[PDB]
Design a protein around this ligand. Structure first.
Ligand SMILES: [Cl-]
Ligand SMILES: [Fe+3]
Length: 267
């Protein structure tokens, strides 16, 4: 599987100029989606924050003062409508939702229990959510006129951090792969062959098309199917619209509102 270098070739998006740098990167990003099936940007300083976050998660995974399993999903208060946040014991991982970051009450306790990790996770969540919303505006701009805004929801979006890790794609609208600790993540190209982005220990983030966006675009953009081939930590933002909101679909240039909700799509 060929390596794909991205450091130094992907568009640069600076942490304190995100909106302006993403506007400049728009054409490069569109050409990635058209030419590869996934997108990429280099964000100077992101790797520093993500590695710190991941290493603090690894330490928390071994801790007992309070243990992360004290915040396993089945003992964390969950939203009446939405996905499941909290810790998933053993390959062991945590979902930090936007709702959890705002304590929606007690859901925030895992971040109060591990505040060094939790502060980094909130920081990375916020950067990732700003970036991914601008990626969605790029993709929207490629879609026919009258395409609605993606309407990604802060509270329904979640940052997953994994501790010990076949081909698949995300169910949601978009994903943002942050630089993992090790190489091994691979993506399939439009020609059906696989590539391995060089991203471990870099400032490069990848943006994945999820299956909700494949549906909303009526097949125009296939999911950014990927797999992990190892020879070990990783984090990714999964961006969702509001679960109770009505699906829509651009069919042959016409906007269609459906009865089914985005929550129905997940089920
Ligand atoms: Cl995924
Ligand atoms: Fe994935």
């Amino acid at each position: 599987v060929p390596l794909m270098e991205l450091s130094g070739r992907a568009p640069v998006v600076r942490l304190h100029d995100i909106e302006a740098d993403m506007a400049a990167a728009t054409d490069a990003i569109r050409s990635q989606l058209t030419g590869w099936g996934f997108m990429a940007a280099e964000v100077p300083g992101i790797g520093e924050r993500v590695e710190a976050m991941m290493n603090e998660f690894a330490a928390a995974c071994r801790a007992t003062g309070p243990s992360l399993s004290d915040y396993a999903y089945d003992v964390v208060p969950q939203l009446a409508v939405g996905g499941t946040h909290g810790f998933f014991p053993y390959k062991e991982f945590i979902h930090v939702s936007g709702a959890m970051i705002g304590d929606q009450p007690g859901a925030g306790d895992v971040l109060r229990a591990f505040p060094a990790f939790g502060t980094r996770a909130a920081e990375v969540f916020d950067i990732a959510f700003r970036l991914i919303s601008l990626f969605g505006e790029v993709v929207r701009g490629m879609m026919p006129p009258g395409t609605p805004e993606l309407d990604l929801s802060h509270d329904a979006t979640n940052l997953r951090v994994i501790h010990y890790r076949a081909e698949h794609s995300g169910i949601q609208m978009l994903g943002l792969q942050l630089p993992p600790s090790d190489q091994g993540l691979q993506y399939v190209l439009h020609d059906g062959t696989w590539v391995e982005p060089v991203i471990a220990g870099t400032d490069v983030v990848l943006c994945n098309i999820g299956r909700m966006l494949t549906s909303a675009s009526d097949g125009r953009f296939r999911p950014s199917t990927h797999r992990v081939h190892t020879k070990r930590l990783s984090s990714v933002l999964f961006a969702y619209p509001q679960h109770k909101a009505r699906q829509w679909k651009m069919v042959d240039g016409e906007l269609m509102s459906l009865n089914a909700t985005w929550g129905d799509f997940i089920d």
